[PDB]
Short mmCIF file of C-alpha atoms and ligand atoms in Angstrom, two decimals:
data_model
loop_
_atom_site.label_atom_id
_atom_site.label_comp_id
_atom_site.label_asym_id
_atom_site.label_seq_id
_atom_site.Cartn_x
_atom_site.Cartn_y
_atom_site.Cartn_z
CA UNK A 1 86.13 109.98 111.89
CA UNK A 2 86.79 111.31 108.24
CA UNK A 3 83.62 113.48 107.17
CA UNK A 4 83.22 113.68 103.59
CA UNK A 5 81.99 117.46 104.10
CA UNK A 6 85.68 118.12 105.63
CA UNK A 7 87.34 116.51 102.44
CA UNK A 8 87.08 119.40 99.80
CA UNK A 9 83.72 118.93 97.42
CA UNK A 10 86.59 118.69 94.65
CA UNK A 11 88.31 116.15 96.40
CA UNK A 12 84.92 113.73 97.54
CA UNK A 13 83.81 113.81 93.24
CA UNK A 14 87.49 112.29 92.52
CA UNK A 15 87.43 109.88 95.46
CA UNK A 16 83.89 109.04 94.54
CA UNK A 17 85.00 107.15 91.55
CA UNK A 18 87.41 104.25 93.50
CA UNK A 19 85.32 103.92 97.24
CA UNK A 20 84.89 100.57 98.31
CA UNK A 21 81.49 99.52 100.44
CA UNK A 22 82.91 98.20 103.78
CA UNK A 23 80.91 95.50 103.51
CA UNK A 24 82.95 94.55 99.84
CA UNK A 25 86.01 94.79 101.71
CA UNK A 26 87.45 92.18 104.67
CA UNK A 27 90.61 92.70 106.36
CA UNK A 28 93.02 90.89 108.44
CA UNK A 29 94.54 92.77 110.99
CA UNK A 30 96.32 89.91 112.51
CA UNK A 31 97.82 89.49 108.97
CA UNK A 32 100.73 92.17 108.47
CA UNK A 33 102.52 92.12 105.16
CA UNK A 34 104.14 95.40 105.17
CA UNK A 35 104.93 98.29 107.35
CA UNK A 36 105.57 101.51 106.41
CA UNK A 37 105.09 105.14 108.12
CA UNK A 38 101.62 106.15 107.74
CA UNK A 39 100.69 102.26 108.89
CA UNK A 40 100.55 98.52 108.49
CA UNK A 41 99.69 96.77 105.16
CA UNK A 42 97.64 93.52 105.84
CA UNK A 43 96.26 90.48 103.66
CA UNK A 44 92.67 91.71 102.62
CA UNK A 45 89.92 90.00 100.22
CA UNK A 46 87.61 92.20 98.04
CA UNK A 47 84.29 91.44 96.69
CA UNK A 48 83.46 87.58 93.54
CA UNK A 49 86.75 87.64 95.71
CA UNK A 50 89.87 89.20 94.98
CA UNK A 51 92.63 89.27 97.13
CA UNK A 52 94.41 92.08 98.11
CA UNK A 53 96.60 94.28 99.97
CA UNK A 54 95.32 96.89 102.27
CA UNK A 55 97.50 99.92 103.35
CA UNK A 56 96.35 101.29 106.05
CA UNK A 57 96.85 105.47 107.03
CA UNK A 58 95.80 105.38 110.34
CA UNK A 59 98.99 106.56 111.67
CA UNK A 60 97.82 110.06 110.02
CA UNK A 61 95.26 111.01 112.53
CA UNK A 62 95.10 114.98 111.13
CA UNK A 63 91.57 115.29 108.94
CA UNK A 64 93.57 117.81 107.04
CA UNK A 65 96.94 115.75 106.13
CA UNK A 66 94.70 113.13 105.15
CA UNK A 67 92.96 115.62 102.93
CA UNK A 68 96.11 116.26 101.52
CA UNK A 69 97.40 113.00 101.19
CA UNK A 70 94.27 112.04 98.91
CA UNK A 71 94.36 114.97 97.16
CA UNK A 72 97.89 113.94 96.07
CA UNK A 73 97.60 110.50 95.06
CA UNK A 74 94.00 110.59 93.37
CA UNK A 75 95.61 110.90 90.14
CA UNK A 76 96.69 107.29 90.33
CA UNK A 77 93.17 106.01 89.54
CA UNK A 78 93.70 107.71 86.14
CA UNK A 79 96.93 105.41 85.15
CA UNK A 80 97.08 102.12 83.97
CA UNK A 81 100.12 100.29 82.47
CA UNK A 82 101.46 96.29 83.18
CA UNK A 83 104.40 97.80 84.85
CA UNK A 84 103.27 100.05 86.55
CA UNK A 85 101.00 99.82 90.37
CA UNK A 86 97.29 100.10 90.28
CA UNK A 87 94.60 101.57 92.65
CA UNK A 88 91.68 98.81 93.59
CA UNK A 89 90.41 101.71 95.58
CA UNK A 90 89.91 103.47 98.56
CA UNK A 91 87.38 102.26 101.57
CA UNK A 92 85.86 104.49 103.95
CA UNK A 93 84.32 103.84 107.11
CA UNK A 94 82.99 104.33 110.90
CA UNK A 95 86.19 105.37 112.70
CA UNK A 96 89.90 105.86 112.14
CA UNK A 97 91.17 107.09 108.30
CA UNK A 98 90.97 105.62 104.98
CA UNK A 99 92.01 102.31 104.07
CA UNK A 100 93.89 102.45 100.83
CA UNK A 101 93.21 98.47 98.61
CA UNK A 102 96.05 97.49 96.36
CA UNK A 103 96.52 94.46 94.53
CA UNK A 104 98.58 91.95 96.12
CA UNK A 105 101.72 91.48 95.29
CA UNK A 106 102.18 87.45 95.58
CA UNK A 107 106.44 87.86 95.70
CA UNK A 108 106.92 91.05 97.62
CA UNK A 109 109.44 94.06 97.02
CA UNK A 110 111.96 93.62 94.16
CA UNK A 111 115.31 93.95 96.72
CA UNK A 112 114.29 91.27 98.92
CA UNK A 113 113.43 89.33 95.77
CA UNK A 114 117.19 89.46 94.35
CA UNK A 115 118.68 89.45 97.88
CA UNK A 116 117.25 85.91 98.68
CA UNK A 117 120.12 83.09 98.35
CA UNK A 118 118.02 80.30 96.73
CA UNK A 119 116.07 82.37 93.90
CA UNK A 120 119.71 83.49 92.98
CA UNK A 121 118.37 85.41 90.11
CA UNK A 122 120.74 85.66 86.84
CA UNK A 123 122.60 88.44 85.00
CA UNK A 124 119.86 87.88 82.50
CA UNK A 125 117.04 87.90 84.83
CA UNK A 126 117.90 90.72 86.87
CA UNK A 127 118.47 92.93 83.53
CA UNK A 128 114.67 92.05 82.34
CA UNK A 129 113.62 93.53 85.98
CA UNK A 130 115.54 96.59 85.01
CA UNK A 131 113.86 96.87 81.55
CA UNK A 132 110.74 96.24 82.88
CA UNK A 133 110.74 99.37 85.62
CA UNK A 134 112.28 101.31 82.90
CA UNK A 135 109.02 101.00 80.65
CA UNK A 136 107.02 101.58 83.53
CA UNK A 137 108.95 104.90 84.19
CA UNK A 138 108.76 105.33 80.30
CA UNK A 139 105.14 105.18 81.09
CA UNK A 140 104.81 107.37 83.90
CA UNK A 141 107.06 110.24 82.70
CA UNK A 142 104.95 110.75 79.73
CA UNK A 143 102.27 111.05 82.06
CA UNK A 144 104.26 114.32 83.56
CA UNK A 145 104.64 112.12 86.70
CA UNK A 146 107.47 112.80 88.88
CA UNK A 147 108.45 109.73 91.44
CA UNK A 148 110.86 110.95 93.32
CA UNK A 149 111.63 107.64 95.20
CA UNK A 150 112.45 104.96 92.74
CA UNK A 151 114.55 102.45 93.91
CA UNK A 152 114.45 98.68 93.83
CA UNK A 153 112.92 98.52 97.53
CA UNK A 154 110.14 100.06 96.29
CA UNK A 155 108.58 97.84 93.01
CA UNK A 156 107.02 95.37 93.23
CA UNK A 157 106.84 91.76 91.65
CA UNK A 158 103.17 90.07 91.15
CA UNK A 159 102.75 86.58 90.71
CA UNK A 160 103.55 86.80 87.18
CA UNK A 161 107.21 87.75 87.96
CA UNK A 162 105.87 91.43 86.34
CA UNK A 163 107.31 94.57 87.94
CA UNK A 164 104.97 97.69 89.03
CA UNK A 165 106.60 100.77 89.96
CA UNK A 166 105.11 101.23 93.15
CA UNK A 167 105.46 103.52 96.16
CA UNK A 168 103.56 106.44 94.81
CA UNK A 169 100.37 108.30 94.92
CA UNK A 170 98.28 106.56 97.64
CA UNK A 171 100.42 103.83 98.11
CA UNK A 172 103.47 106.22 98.82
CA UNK A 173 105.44 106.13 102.01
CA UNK A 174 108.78 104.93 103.65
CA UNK A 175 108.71 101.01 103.81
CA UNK A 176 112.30 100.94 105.22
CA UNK A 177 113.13 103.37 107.47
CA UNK A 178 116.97 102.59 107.45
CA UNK A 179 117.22 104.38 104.23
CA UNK A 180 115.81 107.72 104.74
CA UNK A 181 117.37 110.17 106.34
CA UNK A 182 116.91 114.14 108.18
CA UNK A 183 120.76 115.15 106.64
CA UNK A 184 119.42 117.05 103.88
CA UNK A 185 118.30 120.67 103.13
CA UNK A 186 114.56 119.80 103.81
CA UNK A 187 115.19 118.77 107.42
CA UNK A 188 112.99 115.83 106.83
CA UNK A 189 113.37 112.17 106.33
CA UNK A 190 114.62 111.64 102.13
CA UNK A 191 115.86 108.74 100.27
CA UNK A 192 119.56 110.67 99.79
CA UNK A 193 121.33 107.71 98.65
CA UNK A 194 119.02 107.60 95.87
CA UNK A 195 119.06 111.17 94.98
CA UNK A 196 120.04 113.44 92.17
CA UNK A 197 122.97 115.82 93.02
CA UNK A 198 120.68 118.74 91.99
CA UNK A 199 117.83 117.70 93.95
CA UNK A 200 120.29 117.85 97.34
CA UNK A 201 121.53 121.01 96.48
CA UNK A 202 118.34 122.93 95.20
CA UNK A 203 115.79 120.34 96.98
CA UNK A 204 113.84 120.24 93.19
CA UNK A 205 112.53 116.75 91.43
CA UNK A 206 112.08 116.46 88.33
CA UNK A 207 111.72 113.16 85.84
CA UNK A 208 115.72 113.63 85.37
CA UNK A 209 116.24 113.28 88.91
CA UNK A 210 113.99 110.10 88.18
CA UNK A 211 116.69 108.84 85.69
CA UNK A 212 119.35 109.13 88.25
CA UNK A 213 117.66 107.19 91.02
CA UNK A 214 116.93 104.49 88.10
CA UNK A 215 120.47 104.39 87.83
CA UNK A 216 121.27 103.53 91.76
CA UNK A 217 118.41 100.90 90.98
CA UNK A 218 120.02 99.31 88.31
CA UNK A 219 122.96 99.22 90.26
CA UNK A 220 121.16 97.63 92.76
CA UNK A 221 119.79 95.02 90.62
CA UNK A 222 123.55 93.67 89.20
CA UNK A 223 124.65 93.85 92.74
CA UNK A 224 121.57 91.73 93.96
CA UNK A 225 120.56 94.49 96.55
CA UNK A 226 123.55 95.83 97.79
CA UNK A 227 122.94 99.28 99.89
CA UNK A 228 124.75 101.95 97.92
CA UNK A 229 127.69 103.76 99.04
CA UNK A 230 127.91 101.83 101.80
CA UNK A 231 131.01 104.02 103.25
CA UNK A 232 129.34 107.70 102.41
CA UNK A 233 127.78 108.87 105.51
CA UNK A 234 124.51 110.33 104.85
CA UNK A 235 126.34 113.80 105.82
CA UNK A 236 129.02 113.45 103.02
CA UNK A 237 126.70 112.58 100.24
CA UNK A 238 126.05 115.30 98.22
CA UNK A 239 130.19 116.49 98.13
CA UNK A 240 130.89 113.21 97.18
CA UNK A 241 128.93 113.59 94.07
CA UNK A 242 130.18 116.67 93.60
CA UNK A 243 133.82 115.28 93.58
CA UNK A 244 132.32 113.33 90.32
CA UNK A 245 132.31 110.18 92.56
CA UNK A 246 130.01 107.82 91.55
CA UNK A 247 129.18 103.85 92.28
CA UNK A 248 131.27 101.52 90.56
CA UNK A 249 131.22 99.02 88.08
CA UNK A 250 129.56 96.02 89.91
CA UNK A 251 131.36 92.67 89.44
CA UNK A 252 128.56 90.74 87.27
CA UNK A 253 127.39 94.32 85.52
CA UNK A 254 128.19 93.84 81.75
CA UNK A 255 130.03 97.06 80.45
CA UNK A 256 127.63 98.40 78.66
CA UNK A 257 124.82 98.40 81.56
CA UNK A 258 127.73 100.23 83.35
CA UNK A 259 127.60 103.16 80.61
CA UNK A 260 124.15 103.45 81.42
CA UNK A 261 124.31 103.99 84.51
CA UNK A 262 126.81 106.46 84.56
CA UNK A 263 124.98 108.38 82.12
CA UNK A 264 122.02 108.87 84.34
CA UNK A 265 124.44 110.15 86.81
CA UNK A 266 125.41 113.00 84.41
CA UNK A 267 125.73 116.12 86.59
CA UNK A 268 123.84 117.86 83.51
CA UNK A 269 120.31 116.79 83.88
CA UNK A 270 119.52 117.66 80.49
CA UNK A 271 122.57 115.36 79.24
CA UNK A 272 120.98 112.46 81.09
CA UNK A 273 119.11 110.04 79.04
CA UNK A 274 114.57 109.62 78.82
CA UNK A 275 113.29 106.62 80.21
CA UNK A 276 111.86 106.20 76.01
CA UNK A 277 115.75 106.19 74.85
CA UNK A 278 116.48 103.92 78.57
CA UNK A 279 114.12 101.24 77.28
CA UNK A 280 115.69 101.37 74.27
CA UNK A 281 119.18 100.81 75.23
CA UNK A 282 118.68 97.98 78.11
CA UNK A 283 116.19 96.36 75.36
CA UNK A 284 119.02 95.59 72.89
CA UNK A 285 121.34 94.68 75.89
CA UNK A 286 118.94 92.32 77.23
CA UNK A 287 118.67 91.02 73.59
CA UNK A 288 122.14 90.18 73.71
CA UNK A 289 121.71 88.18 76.23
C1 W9Z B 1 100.69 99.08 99.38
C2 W9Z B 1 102.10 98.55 99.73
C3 W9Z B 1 102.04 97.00 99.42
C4 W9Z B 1 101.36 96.54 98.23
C5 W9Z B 1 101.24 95.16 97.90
C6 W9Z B 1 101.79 94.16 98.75
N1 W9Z B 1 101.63 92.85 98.39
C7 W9Z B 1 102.16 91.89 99.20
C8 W9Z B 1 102.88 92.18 100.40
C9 W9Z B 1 103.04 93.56 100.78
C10 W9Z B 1 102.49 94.59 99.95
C11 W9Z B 1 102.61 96.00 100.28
C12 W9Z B 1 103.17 99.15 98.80
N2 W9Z B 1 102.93 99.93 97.80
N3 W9Z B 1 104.04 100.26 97.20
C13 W9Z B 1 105.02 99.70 97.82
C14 W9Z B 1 106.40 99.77 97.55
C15 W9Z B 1 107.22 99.04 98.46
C16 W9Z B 1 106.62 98.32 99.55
C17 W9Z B 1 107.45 97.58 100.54
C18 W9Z B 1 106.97 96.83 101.70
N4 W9Z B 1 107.99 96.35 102.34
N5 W9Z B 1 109.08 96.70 101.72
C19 W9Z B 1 110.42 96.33 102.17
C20 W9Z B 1 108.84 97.48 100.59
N6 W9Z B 1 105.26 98.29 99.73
N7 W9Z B 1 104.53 98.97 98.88
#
């Protein structure tokens, strides 16, 4: 039972703004549509319906991590761009934590999108997802807002074929387990694959460590989902990168995409591009297209 005099004052007047009345809110349990870590996500239906997607946190039974946990992702409710994942709100209730509303999202997680044989997405199409998380990045960077687990597993595509950077604030947490991994510094379970060499070594994120993961997810867009370094164990990783290996050119990636990439695997941060000049450059290559 989560007692609002347990959640910090400071914390209750920010989650005050986003509850949801129990009553607004139905779920279907019998109805999962995601799994990740902290719990299930199921079909819900808020109230004048909407439908929705309900992450559940029940899986973090501590009062005080789920303090923490809110405290963290609050911030969300004060964001609001086309590409970028939005907070319905946040629904108390009688027993068991804090149910977490999205909106649905009616065609799922962008690598499963481009990995399924008959939508056989273009060169052309899978570019426009990549300018599309870019701007949401773009977005969220300006906002000081560090990721630090962008990959294409982890936007989204609404009904509208629009991407949302998702997997953040409330709605963050490991929706593939396959992919994160204890080999690290930290001794706990991070998207390596997808990190910045810097970020292994010192165990730091920052928005340029952002730009590199957006370049594993580009690659992972031209390659239609392909897991990364498929050969590097997740114990060889970070001297791999520091051999100035990198992933290579993928067989439908037009040269120029390929420069991009590479550039946001500059072992510089500073020399690595900003998501405003990234937006930029895919722009005019998707233009020539
Ligand atoms: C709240 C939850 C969510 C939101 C909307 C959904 N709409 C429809 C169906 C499921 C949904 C799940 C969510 N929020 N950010 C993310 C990012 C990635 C993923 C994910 C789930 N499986 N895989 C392979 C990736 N889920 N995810």
């Amino acid at each position: 039972h989560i007692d609002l005099s347990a959640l910090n004052p400071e914390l209750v007047q920010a989650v005050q703004h986003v509850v949801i009345g129990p009553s607004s809110l139905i779920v279907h349990f019998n109805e999962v549509i995601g799994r990740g870590h902290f719990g299930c996500v199921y079909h819900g239906t808020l109230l004048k319906k909407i439908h929705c997607a309900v992450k559940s946190l029940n899986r973090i039974t501590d009062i005080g991590e789920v303090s923490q946990f809110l405290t963290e992702g609050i911030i969300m409710k004060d964001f609001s761009h086309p590409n970028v994942l939005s907070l319905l709100g946040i629904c108390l209730r009688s027993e068991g934590s804090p149910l977490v509303v999205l909106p649905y999202m009616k065609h799922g997680d962008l690598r499963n999108f481009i990995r399924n044989e008959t939508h056989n997405p273009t060169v052309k199409d899978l570019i426009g997802f990549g300018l599309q998380v870019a701007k949401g990045m773009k977005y969220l960077a300006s906002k000081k807002f560090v990721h630090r687990d962008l990959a294409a597993r982890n936007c989204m595509l609404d009904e509208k074929f629009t991407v949302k950077v998702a997997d953040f604030g409330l709605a963050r947490d490991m929706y593939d387990k396959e992919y994160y991994s204890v080999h690290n510094k930290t001794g706990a379970k991070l998207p390596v694959k997808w990190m910045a060499l810097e970020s292994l070594q010192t165990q730091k994120f920052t928005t340029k460590s952002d730009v590199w993961s957006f370049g594993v997810l580009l690659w992972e867009l031209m390659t239609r989902g392909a897991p990364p370094y498929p050969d590097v164990n997740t114990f060889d990783i970070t001297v791999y990168l520091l051999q100035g290996r990198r992933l290579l050119q993928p067989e439908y990636c037009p040269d120029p995409l390929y420069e991009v990439m590479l550039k946001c695997w500059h072992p510089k941060a500073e020399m690595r591009p900003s998501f405003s000049e990234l937006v930029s450059r895919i722009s005019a290559i998707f233009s020539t297209f």
